[PDB]
Swiss-Prot record, chain A:
Quaternary context: Component of the large ribosomal subunit.
The protein's name: Large ribosomal subunit protein eL28
Gene Ontology MF, one: structural constituent of ribosome
Disulfide partners: none
Curated annotation (Swiss-Prot), chain C:
Gene that this sequence comes from: RPL27A
Post-translational modification: Hydroxylated on His-38 by MINA.
Species name: Oryctolagus cuniculus (Rabbit)
Record's keyword annotation contains Phosphoprotein: yes
Record field: compositional bias (Basic residues): 1-29
Residue numbers carrying Phosphoserine: S67
SS bonds (residue pairs): none
A GO cellular component annotation in the UniProt record: cytosolic large ribosomal subunit
Keywords, ordered alphabetically: Acetylation, Cytoplasm, Hydroxylation, Phosphoprotein, Ribonucleoprotein, Ribosomal protein
Location of region: Disordered: 1-36
Top-rank taxon: Eukaryota
GO biological process entries: translation
Name recorded for this polypeptide: Large ribosomal subunit protein uL15
Sequence positions bearing (3S)-3-hydroxyhistidine: H38
Curated annotation (Swiss-Prot), chain D:
Family: Belongs to the universal ribosomal protein uL4 family.
Superkingdom of origin: Eukaryota
PTM note: Citrullinated by PADI4.
Official protein name in the record: Large ribosomal subunit protein uL4
Residues of the full protein shown: 134 to 182 of 413
Compartmental location: Cytoplasm
Disulfide bonds: none
Source organism of this protein record: Oryctolagus cuniculus
Protein role: Component of the large ribosomal subunit. The ribosome is a large ribonucleoprotein complex responsible for the synthesis of proteins in the cell.
The protein's assembly and partners: Component of the large ribosomal subunit. May bind IPO9 with low affinity. Interacts with RBM3.
From Swiss-Prot, chain F:
Naturally occurring in which organism (per UniProt): Oryctolagus cuniculus
Record's keyword terms, sorted: Acetylation, Cytoplasm, Phosphoprotein, Repeat, Ribonucleoprotein, Ribosomal protein, RNA-binding
Residue positions where Phosphotyrosine is found in the record: Y116
InterPro entries hit by this protein: Ribo_uL30_ferredoxin-like_sf, Ribosomal_uL30, Ribosomal_uL30_CS, Ribosomal_uL30_euk, Ribosomal_uL30_euk_arc, Ribosomal_uL30_ferredoxin-like, Ribosomal_uL30_N_euk
GO molecular function terms listed in the Swiss-Prot or TrEMBL record: RNA binding; structural constituent of ribosome
Keyword Membrane: no
Record's protein name: Large ribosomal subunit protein uL30
Length: 124, 34, 147, 49, 52, 225, 49, 187
RNA sequence: UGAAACCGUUAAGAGGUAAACGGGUGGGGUCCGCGCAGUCCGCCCGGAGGAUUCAACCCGGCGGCGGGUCCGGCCGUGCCGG
RNA sequence: ACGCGUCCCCCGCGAGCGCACGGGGUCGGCGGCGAUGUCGGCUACCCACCCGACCCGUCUUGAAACACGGACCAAGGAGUCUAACACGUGCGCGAGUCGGGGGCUACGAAAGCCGCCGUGGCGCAAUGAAGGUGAAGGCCGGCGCCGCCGGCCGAGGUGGGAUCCCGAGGCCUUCCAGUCCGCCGAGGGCGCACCACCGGCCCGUCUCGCCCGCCGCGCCGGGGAGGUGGAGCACGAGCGCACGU
RNA sequence: AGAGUGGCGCGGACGCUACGCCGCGACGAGUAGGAGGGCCGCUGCGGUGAGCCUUGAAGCCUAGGGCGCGGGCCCGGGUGGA
């Protein structure tokens, strides 16, 4: 299961970074970037991710297809959202809630798709 | 699940053929990092 | 490994686990088994009674192959065959009996331990102890000897 | 496949699986054939690492 | 000085053993000779068996 | 679904409250009935002595049931019989105290430790201030506080000691579940005496503090609690 | 040959049999006491008796 | 100061299983849960056994397990063994039992399953019956290991029957001055 | 590359109970804050504007799912035949 | 002590606002001082004063000692490999286990393979100086006693023993039956390991008594009752690898 | 907080490296000597860091600034030159 390979990874991966009494994780689709069992971004059968879009403008989102969990060049599926900051977040809350697609992440993907725009907006 | 899928076989150009192998059971035996 | 041992937790302490008062000094009792009837008496005579003295006759050029006697009990005397001499023998009407040879599985004398699985059996054996005779005969079987 | 990533390897684009190939890779003596071949199956990125 | 319960036992290191110690670091390319000069043998004796 | 079940969910709540208001009146009527005892027992000891003194008699008042004990010497250097007897009274440190019922087996323990303690026969004021201010419990192998009446009703209960009022009766009158309601208590936690000691080493009778005081233990309590 | 057959204990915990044979939870915390001296404080003293 | 000692009051039970193997540590996780949230006992005894060390949990054999269910009554009932289930040669006829151990040795699979009786492991006794109903809790013998025949009253004293540590037995190896009435004394 | 011991010279500091050390404060230096009018983050209301823009309806592509009863194919530490 | 419908000695869901000695603190309160001379900075450099403070290692009942080594600084400087043993702990396989010598065919002097390469080691059997011996029994029939004839069950108690199994009775929303699915339970059942006590079986030895078996009829072989010596039986836990003491 | 047969507005903080978090009590001297834990140091070998370095590596120096009870470690400046 997922629950197996955690026991394997937990304290060993090439994506693990420790020091100064802290501890982090640099895995593709970890949104909170921390070595955890909610938040790891490869293990499971379904995945959410929020990446900063191609050029400057926008945000890009990442679901994991339920099917072929053994076929990685056709496993993730992509879409870009380049609209107003309150209205862009209509989409993302309408992905997690109304699909029933893994209802833990809700309030992680609202605080990551609002500190990817507060960037590309011009500086103080 | 010992349950086995079907394994596709790629040509040396990259596109897949239409030939498959049933999974060698070794690939279901336990992971044991110790 | 030289890291998980005691001697790292002791760089810093003086006496290193062998004493302030009476130190680690070379050989305090005498080397090896000393004091066998003096000052290491008690011990010797309280975990090794009978070290000190003679008994019995001495045989000189002892060749041990002449003394050679392997052993096979009853309970598990059916352990020298396949699982085919017993299931078809239990099926019979006229009442047959398979021939377990014990010289073929490195066994010389046949011993008398547990039960028997009760169905006819002829038994070759170089040495029959007195219970291996009376257990096999009461059930029903011969006792042929071999040399 | 979540294990093979964590040994660093560069698999995000690999078609599939535990990968298999027709028996015509056993006889290649040229590296320019075997390099072109490594770029087809989408794993050159691991050599490039 | 025997502590307590614990088997009595006689060692033969009272001689100068170290001066006569034998090791087998050779063990791997001593085999690979025999097998070579083994492999010489029967090319010398062609259709005669190497089983002799 | 629900519209039925929500009204049935507004019938069980008023039941658990009614379990309190039938119990809330009983805490009052238990306390107003012990007040009747503490004028009917108080004035019935002044009743007999006048009506003896009347006919040229005498009246010896009732010899004690109950006695408080406080440990005044320290913890260093102590003889091995006394360490065992001070343990059994649960006085394990200096300036600590306990309730103790009286008999022959109970006094002759208190003659072996009679230069490590001070004891005496306490009153209706030196029973309650101690049990009100200081008094803790011993629930789940812990010294957890009594700011409630579902700790004493909840542990003991079956003996009929529910509220803070019955811990006054059963101790101040040594009644018929005393043992359990006094091994109920953790021993008390008095700070030092504010005024002081007379001379700690010696027996009261000589000058100092040690040994029994029959009616002036009331002076080393309102100074210490 | 496997010690345990389904390592998946994200899913074994929530199938019909295991969630019809366990008592209910206790998700409340009970923080520590400050003993208001009832010889001084009124309503603290009206609660005892 | 307060007169107490701090002498034995760190207790020495074992809180968690020293081994590393993962499939035993998802095992425990299950039963940690299953101990605390039920009102059945079995679970708690099983979790405490999932910690112990090889020697405190020794191989129960087929012919003991066979022998422990042919007593009067106990039927419709399984047999849990938090070590193993090994073969026994001196036993022939095999009924249709139900087993649930950690390692089932590779010949006692070919015996009980061929008689028409299934074997489980520790996540097939976790859904089949969560609390614990229809079981007999068996173990093997914790006084098998020779070691126990060097222990007790020390072999050189009245009335005692211990094996001492001897380099080898023969006809002379510890054979004289405290074993014979004739050579000083025997005990 | 160029450490310590030990010297020599500039600045400061101090100086009758050999010096040096621990607790606790005061004075003076050195630098350092980049200090010298003082914090952001939502929703709400009033008053000045920007940008072709929101609901809804049809047009293609993709997922999340069960169609409590559509059709096949593929597994099996599942069996019953030949 | 405060509606009413019936039982009596004795003459089961009302409506809202509000204040607080009530399961650990908050002002829906204020004021000065701010650019080349002032704000702050516990920490690290120098000075000053009050209280405290004898030099370290060390053997020793006792060291600041009129007990011994120490003028200062660098760089080196002391429980270690291998051969036995034993107890504990991890891991593979389990009445078994193990190829360690031998073989076959850059990293590799590695690594996969033999099975009719397990010879062999340790283990599954004790006990006697030896010749040697070598590990349950019951309960009904053919002739109140032998010597033999059939049929059935079987590794034997008592006492304490983690858990399971049977369930008298009950687990509420107007009442009167009726159930399925779960849980709570008076007392009453099979008794896993570990022990304490009682019986038995194999070797050695001691005292008493009568019959068996025979190609060789004995200075021949075998059975029976009660004491006693053991590192013994009595439904098995060992073997290879690694770590620590 | 049981289940039946009859009489307008599509919205609601944090969590759970389960080898983690959280929850309420009692205690805390130590020489010979035991034991655990060390995100305390020093040098080598397999893995890993799409690590870092002539736009300045190691070592040293530093009345510059920070970190932990502690062993020790992080950053400013100057040297130095792989």
């Amino acid at each position: 299961s997922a629950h197996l390979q955690w026991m394997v990874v937990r304290n060993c991966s090439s994506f693990l970074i420790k020091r100064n009494k802290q501890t982090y994780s640099t895995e593709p689709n970890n949104l909170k970037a921390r070595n955890s069992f909610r938040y790891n971004g490869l293990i499971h059968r379904k995945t959410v991710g929020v990446e900063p879009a191609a050029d400057g403008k926008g945000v890009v989102v990442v679901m994991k297809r339920r099917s072929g969990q053994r076929k990685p060049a056709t496993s993730y599926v992509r879409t870009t959202i380049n609209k107003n900051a309150r209205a862009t977040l209509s989409s993302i809350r309408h992905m997690i809630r109304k699909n029933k697609y893994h209802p833990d992440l809700r309030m992680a993907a609202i605080r990551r798709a609002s500190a990817i725009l507060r960037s590309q907006k011009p500086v103080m | 699940a010992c349950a086995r899928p079907l394994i596709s076989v790629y040509s040396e150009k990259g596109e897949s053929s239409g030939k498959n192998v049933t999974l060698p059971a070794v690939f279901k035996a336990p992971i044991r990092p110790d | 490994p030289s890291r998980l041992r005691k001697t790292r937790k002791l760089r810093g302490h003086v006496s290193h686990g062998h004493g302030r008062i009476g130190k680690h000094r070379k050989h305090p009792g005498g080397r090896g088994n000393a004091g066998g009837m003096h000052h290491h008496r008690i011990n010797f005579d309280k975990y090794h009674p009978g070290y000190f003295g003679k008994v019995g006759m001495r045989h000189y050029h002892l060749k041990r192959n002449q003394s050679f006697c392997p052993t096979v009990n009853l309970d598990k005397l059916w352990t020298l065959v396949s699982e085919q001499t017993r299931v078809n023998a239990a099926k019979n009407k006229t009442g047959a009996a398979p021939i377990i040879d014990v010289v073929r599985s490195g066994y010389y004398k046949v011993l008398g331990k547990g039960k028997l699985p009760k169905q006819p059996v002829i038994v070759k054996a170089k040495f029959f102890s007195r219970r291996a005779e009376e257990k096999i005969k009461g059930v029903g079987g011969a006792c042929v000897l071999v040399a | 496949p979540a294990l093979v990533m964590s040994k660093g390897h560069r698999i995000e684009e690999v078609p599939e699986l535990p990968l298999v190939v027709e028996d015509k890779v056993e006889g290649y003596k040229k590296t320019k054939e075997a390099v072109l071949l490594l770029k087809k199956l989408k794993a050159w990125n691991d050599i490039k690492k | 000085a025997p502590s307590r319960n614990g088997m009595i036992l006689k060692p033969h290191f009272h001689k100068d053993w170290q001066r006569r110690v034998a090791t087998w670091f050779n063990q791997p390319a001593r085999k690979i000779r025999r097998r070579k000069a083994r492999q010489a043998r029967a090319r010398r004796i062609a259709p005669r068996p190497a089983a002799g | 679904n629900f519209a039925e079940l929500k009204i049935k969910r507004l019938r069980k709540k008023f039941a658990q409250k009614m379990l309190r208001k039938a119990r809330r009146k009983l805490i009052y009527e238990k306390a107003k009935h012990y007040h009747k005892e503490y004028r009917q027992m108080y004035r019935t000891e002044i009743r007999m002595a006048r009506m003896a003194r009347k006919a040229g008699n005498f009246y010896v008042p009732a010899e004690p049931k109950l006695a408080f004990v406080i440990r005044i010497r320290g913890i260093n250097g102590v003889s091995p019989k006394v360490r065992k007897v001070l343990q059994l009274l649960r006085l394990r440190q200096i300036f600590n105290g306990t309730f103790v019922k009286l008999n022959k087996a109970s006094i002759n323990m208190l003659r072996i430790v009679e230069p490590y303690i001070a004891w005496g026969y306490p009153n209706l004021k030196s029973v309650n201030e101690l049990i009100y201010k200081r008094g803790y419990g011993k629930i789940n192998k812990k010294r957890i506080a009594l700011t409630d009446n579902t700790l004493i009703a909840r542990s003991l209960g079956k003996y009929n000691i529910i509220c803070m009022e019955d811990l006054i009766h059963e101790i101040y009158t040594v009644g018929k579940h005393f043992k359990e309601a006094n091994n109920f208590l953790w021993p008390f936690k008095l700070s030092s005496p504010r005024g002081g000691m007379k001379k700690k080493t010696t027996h009261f009778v000589e000058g100092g503090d040690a040994g029994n005081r029959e009616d002036q233990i009331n002076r080393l309590i309102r100074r210490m609690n | 040959m496997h010690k345990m057959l389904n390592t998946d204990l994200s899913r074994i915990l929530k199938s019909p049999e295991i969630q019809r044979a366990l008592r209910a939870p206790r998700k409340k915390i009970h923080r520590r006491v400050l003993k208001k001296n009832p010889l001084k404080n009124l309503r603290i003293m009206l609660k005892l008796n | 100061g307060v007169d107490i000692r701090h002498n034995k009051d760190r207790k020495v039970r074992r809180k968690e299983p020293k081994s590393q193997d993962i499939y035993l540590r998802l095992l425990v996780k299950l039963y940690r849960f299953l101990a605390r949230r039920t009102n059945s006992t079995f679970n708690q005894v099983v979790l405490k056994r999932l910690f112990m060390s090889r020697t405190n949990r020794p191989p129960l054999s087929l012919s003991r397990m066979i022998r422990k269910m042919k007593l009067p009554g106990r039927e419709n009932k399984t047999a849990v063994v938090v070590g193993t289930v090994t073969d026994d040669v001196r036993v022939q006829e095999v009924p249709k039992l139900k087993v649930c151990a950690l390692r089932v040795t590779s010949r006692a699979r070919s015996r009980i399953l061929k008689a028409g009786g299934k074997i489980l492991t520790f996540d097939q006794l976790a859904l089949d019956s969560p609390k614990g109903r229809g079981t007999v809790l068996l173990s093997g013998p914790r006084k098998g290991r020779e070691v126990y025949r060097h222990f007790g009253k020390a072999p050189g004293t009245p009335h005692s029957h211990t094996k001492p540590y001897v380099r080898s037995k023969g006809r002379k190896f510890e054979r004289a001055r405290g074993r014979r009435a004739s050579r000083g004394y025997k005990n």
